[PDB]
Structures are given as structure tokens and as C-alpha cells.
């Protein structure tokens, strides 16, 4: 899972 | 950006008050809190001028490094006025008596309470808190030059904050040294809590929630 | 007494250079671990003697002198290495005849990681142009900051901090530049401290593997972790 | 033992 990058790249 | 405006930038980045909305249950409540706070920590970092101008590898690495020290720095500021109290959340206040209920915690609660007392004694200001929390993120192990410039501007902001207290030149330097020497104490606590959490995950005794699991695994 | 006098005291207090010969053979797991632990053990002895020569150190509780030294020893070893290694880029000057390239790290599982941090931190010290009198004050601050004896420790830590501030001001840079320099030096404390933790875990692991030797003092100081 | 002895007996 990649939720750090998901949240880093969106709002 | 004038150091004043950087600090307002940081003021404006502050994450909201988090609530856990109600032994095993203490630990379950700390992990569940850690997961919610990591969500808000990500938005917080994104709002530090220039953080989103760093490489995504840099952004990922600085948050993976620093997250527990940034959770703990926040805990100490929320705990500063409440000696004997670790103010995890409004619906989660713990003393070292509760700390006792789970092997390895009391040691951690003690380090956090000691360090907190050190900041209470120094009367840590809010604006000092904001600068050092950011410093913890930026100072954790081209984009290399952008990060040096970002860390150097938050360092600059903390020296200004201190300049504004009005104390003597000598006393500012001594105040700056005393706040910064406390960072290796946060990093000490951080190392201990991460060790305890890795051990807790390894045994599958608490739910190591999604964003939290990813963040622990990085270490 | 005065900051200058504290610095002059620390200067005199510097331990002597410990001599270790490189193994005749190219390095093995065993010969590299044997060389670095022999050196650590001999340096720990001189450390305790150096600590006793810090004004007010011996006025502390015996049990605080033990806790500070158990807490900081690896960090203090590592700051000494980085200062020995600062006039010799790429190299780690563990001893006059025990100079190691990041390369020879190869010879022990995981010690290449450690050598990198050590070279990276050393680099930042070289970029900051860390001075001798600064190094003296900073090494002292690492021992005193590694946390009525508690009232006396606080006062001793502020005296070395006062000394560093005095050294930096002797440079004549503006006040704002003194603050920045003091900040940049100190923010490295956490980096040294990281290198110490990884280094201690590593040593604890190598001891588990049967690789470590029998050294009373070093084993003693590692068991307080 | 050895740390305490070096601190006190030396
Ligand atoms: N103490 C503690 C927490 C981490 C933490 C620190 C600051 C916060 O604001 C929120 C949480 C902990 C310690 C051991 C452990 O196994 C798990 C956890 Cl979550
Ligand atoms: N690097 C290194 C050494 C420690 C050291 C550092 C500075 C000195 O002046 C002397 C020794 C080490 C690293 C890992 C390990 O498992 C064992 C050892 Cl001895």
C-alpha cells in the first residue's frame, strides 16, 4: 500500500 | 518570505485537534491516534513553503524518518501546561500509572514527561514550538540544495522568534542552544517508541493500521 | 571559571592518540571487528579519564557520572573520529595507522551504512569549517547532554554552552551569524546521535553472532544500551 | 564494576 504518496500527491 | 511570515505560514499549517472517539485498549487507542495524526501530518508538511517543491523521494524520506519525533513533539506542546499529564488527545489523557499497564511503555512515558518538563522550565513559546517541530522534519536523515535552503530559513525563523522575546544577545544564544540540545532527547524518545512499536507489530497484538503500518515498515 | 579558562581546560584534557596497527593481511570480518573493538576499548579507558578532567564532572553523583558515560560513549567516540577525519576527506582516521576508506567497510555486513553517516556528518563539519575550540565544546556538550547532582549538571552544561558561544563570538561574525552557526553546529547533534544508535545496534548484533571479542569495559558499556 | 572503579579507584 502507498497511502503516503497518495496523500502527498492529492488534497 | 520574512521570518515573521514563514512563522505565520507554519501557524497556518497547524493540524487540527484529533480525538480517538472512544491494557489492549490503551495501546489500541495510541495506534488509532497515531494513524489519524499521520494523515494530518502529511497535509501539515505539504503546507511548509517549499516542501512540495522537493523531490517526491525527499518528501517521502523526510516524513518516513521524522514522523514519530513529530508526533512526540506535538504531544509535549499539548502536555506543556499539564505536568504528570501526557495529553495524547482530549479523550486520551495518560499518567505514568496507566503507562505501567503495558511492558516497555513506562520508560517511554518517563522520557516524554522528563523532556516535556524541560520545555516547561524553558517556557517554550508557541512560535518556538512551530519552528522546532518543522526543524525536526527538515533535519531528519539539487533537491538536496532546496532542503538545505528550507532548513536554513526555519533556523532563521527560530532565531527571529527568540530575538523578539527582547532578552539579551547572550541570553538569545543560550536560549537557542537550550531548545536545540533538547532535539536529541526527542530523537532518543522517538528511537525507543519505534523499537516498542516494531516489537508490538511483530507479535500482532495491536492493529498496526494502514498508513501507520506503511510508516513503521519504512524503518 | 571564565569561558576561555573552560576551553583551555578542555584543550589540556584532550585524550592522547591511541595507536592500533592495521592487520598485515587485507581485512576480514574478524580482523576488522577485532581492530575497531580493540580501539573502542582503549579509547573508553581514556574517555573516563577525559570526563574526570571536565570542571565539575567529578562533583556530580557517581550514579550520574555512570549514566552520562553509558549514555554518550559511542556518540563521543564518533565525534572524535569525525574530528580526526576532517583534514582527510573520503577517509575515516580511526587511528594514525588505522585509516579506512568507505571501501573497506565491505569486509563486515552492515558497517558500510555506518561509515557513510560518519563520512556524511564529517562532511557537514568540514563544510561548516568546525574549529578546534568549537569541537572541544561540542564533544563536552555531547557527554553533558546525554540524559543536588541535577542542579549541578544543568549548570555544567550551560558553562560549556557559554564557552562555545564565546568561541563563536571570538570569530567577529555579526550576532545574527553567531546564532545561525550555533544552530547549524547543534542541529548536527541529532545526526551524530543517529550514527551512535545504528553503531550500537550493529555492535550488539555482531556480539550475538560470536564475532565480538572478550573486552571487560566495552562489553560493560554496550550492556548499558 | 570496571566503569565505577576507573571513575573512583583511578
Ligand atoms: N507514546 C507513544 C505512542 C506513539 C505516539 C506518540 C505521540 C503521539 O502524539 C501519538 C502516538 C506509542 C508508543 C509505543 C507503541 O508501541 C505505540 C505507540 Cl502508538
Ligand atoms: N565505526 C565504528 C566502530 C565504533 C568506533 C567509533 C569511533 C571510534 O573512535 C572508535 C570506535 C564500530 C561500529 C560498529 C560496530 O559493530 C562496532 C564498532 Cl567498534
Residue spans of beta strands (DSSP E) within B55-213: 86-89, 92-94
What resolution does the deposited structure have, in angstroms? 2.2
Chain D residues in contact with C219 (beta carbon < 8 A): none
Report CB contact under 8 Å: D8, C62.
yes
CA angle (B193 as vertex; B190, B199 as ends), nearest 5: 140
**Are the C-beta atoms of B75 and B30 separated by less than 8 Å?**
no
Residue with cell string 508538511? B45
CB of residue B34 inside a 6 A radius of ligand 1:
yes
Q: How far is the CA of C88 from the centre of ligand 2 (A)?
A: 18
Chain C CB contacts of D8 under 8 Å are 62
Burial bucket for residue B46 (CB in 10 Å: 0-12, 13-18, 19+): middle
Q: How many domains does one find in chain B? A: 1
d(CA C154, CA C162): 12
Q: DSSP of B25-39, one letter per residue?
A: HHHHHHHHHHHHHHH
In this structure, which residue's CA is closest to atom 8 in ligand 2?
C77
Which grid coordinates are listed for B171?
541570553
- Residues B24, B27, B31: CA angle, nearest 5 degrees: 135
Range of the structural domain that residue C159 is part of: 3-223
Using an 8 Å CB-CB cutoff, list chain C residues near D4.
62, 66
Cell digits for C198? 545504528
Q: CATH number of the domain that C205 lies in?
A: 1.10.565.10
| Distance separating alpha carbons of residues B204 and C9, to the nearest angstrom | 54
Query: What is the rounded CA–CA span in Å between residue C28 and residue C33?
Result: 8
Kindly state the helix (H) or strand (E) to which residue C212 belongs, with its residue range. none
Residues 6+ apart with CB under 8 A from B40: B15, B16, B18
DSSP class of residue C22 equals P
The residue contributing the CA closest to ligand 1 atom 15 is B197
B71 lines ligand 1 (CB under 6 A): yes
Alpha-carbon distance C60 to C66, whole Å?
10
Q: Is C20 left (phi over 0), alpha (psi -120 to 50) or beta?
A: beta
Amino acid at each position: 500500500s502507498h497511502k503516503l504518496v497518495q496523500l502527498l500527491t492529492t488534497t | 518570505l520574512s521570518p515573521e511570515q514563514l512563522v505565520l505560514t507554519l501557524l497556518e499549517a497547524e493540524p487540527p485537534h484529533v480525538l480517538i472517539s472512544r491494557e489492549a485498549s490503551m495501546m489500541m487507542s495510541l495506534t488509532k491516534l497515531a494513524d489519524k495524526e499521520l494523515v494530518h501530518m502529511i497535509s501539515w508538511a505539504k503546507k511548509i513553503p517549499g516542501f512540495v517543491e522537493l523531490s517526491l523521494f525527499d518528501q517521502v524520506r523526510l516524513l518516513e524518518s521524522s514522523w514519530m519525533e513529530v508526533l512526540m513533539m506535538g504531544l509535549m506542546w499539548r502536555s506543556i501546561d499539564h505536568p504528570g499529564k501526557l495529553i495524547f488527545a482530549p479523550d486520551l489523557v495518560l499518567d505514568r500509572d496507566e503507562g505501567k499497564s503495558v511492558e516497555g511503555i513506562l520508560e517511554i512515558f518517563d522520557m516524554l514527561l522528563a523532556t516535556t518538563s524541560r520545555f516547561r522550565e524553558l517556557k517554550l513559546q508557541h512560535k518556538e514550538y512551530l519552528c522546532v517541530k518543522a526543524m525536526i522534519l527538515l533535519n531528519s536523515s539539487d533537491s538536496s540544495r532546496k532542503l538545505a535552503h528550507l532548513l536554513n530559513a526555519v533556523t532563521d525563523a527560530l532565531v527571529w522568534v527568540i530575538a523578539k522575546s527582547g532578552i539579551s544577545s547572550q541570553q538569545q544564544s543560550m536560549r537557542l542552544a537550550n531548545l536545540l540540545m533538547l532535539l536529541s532527547h526527542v530523537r532518543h524518545a522517538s528511537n525507543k517508541g519505534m523499537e516498542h512499536l516494531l516489537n508490538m507489530k511483530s507479535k500482532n497484538v495491536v492493529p498496526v493500521y494502514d498508513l501507520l503500518l506503511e510508516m513503521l515498515n519504512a524503518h
